[PDB]
């Protein structure tokens, strides 16, 4: 099954949610953003020294 | 995405590490001899090749002449350019002569 949820951008902040399906016990779902990795695209221009 | 351009992707041409998904499903043995029947979708590279459309060389506005090794255009004309030219004083000639 597929479930949608919004989470803050932050580490060490577990977020808990449930999924509702008839005849199925609500299933605990824990989501943790372990870390972030912002990697941009860059080009080498020149060097100096 | 099976049956699409860039189905097989790699960081470099000779990269040992690769990632791909093209919907391969195994079939159960169904004959006398030992055999492995495999079913898979058509390769996406030839797919994009068949109906890739016309090349950019026939679509560039202003007739840009595109070269690949720099991936750059040349001999393409559009727009205006303001410029400032500095000329040495010695190059000038007095009106007396």
């Amino acid at each position: 099954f597929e479930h949608a949820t919004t989470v803050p951008n932050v580490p060490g902040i577990p977020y808990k949610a449930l999924v509702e399906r008839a005849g199925y016990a609500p299933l605990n779902l824990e989501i943790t953003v372990v870390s972030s990795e912002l990697t941009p695209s860059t080009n080498k221009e020149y060097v100096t020294c | 995405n099976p049956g699409a351009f860039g189905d097989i992707q790699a960081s470099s041409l000779d990269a040992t590490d690769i990632v791909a998904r093209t919907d391969i499903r195994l079939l159960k043995p169904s004959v006398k001899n030992i055999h492995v029947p495999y079913t898979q979708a058509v390769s996406g590279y030839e797919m994009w090749k068949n109906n890739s459309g016309r090349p950019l060389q026939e679509t560039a506005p202003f007739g840009c002449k595109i070269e690949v090794e720099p991936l750059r255009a040349t001999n393409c004309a559009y727009g205006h350019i303001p410029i400032s030219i500095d000329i040495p004083d010695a190059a000038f000639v007095r009106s007396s002569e």
């Binding site: 695209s41 | 860039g6 093209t22 030992i34 492995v36």
Partner: protein, 97 residues
């Protein structure tokens, strides 16, 4: 364009076995019991349909790819280079900026 890998299947005779994944890209694996192994040499091994076989496959770029490679490029910040030739006092000078 890629090529599927069709390695020699694993056969466990009159016993059991379990599937294992592989780091190869787009890998697939699956077991099958009640196999019916035969070959020119004949029934590879013997047990009253108890034997089973594991099959698996993956994909790899074909050698032709070495020269048939197509690269996906992300581009930005177009920069223009202009070559100017300036004549002054019947003297010709050049620049590229």
């Amino acid at each position: 364009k890629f090529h599927t890998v069709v390695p020699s299947p694993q056969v466990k005779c009159c016993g059991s076995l379990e599937c294992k994944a592989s780091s190869k890209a787009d890998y697939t694996c699956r077991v099958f019991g009640g196999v019916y192994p035969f070959m020119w040499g004949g029934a590879q091994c013997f047990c009253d349909s108890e034997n089973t076989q594991l099959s698996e496959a993956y994909v790899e770029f074909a050698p032709d790819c070495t020269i048939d490679h197509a690269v996906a490029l992300k581009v930005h910040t177009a920069a223009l280079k202009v070559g100017l030739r300036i004549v002054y006092g019947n003297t010709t000078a050049r620049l590229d900026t």
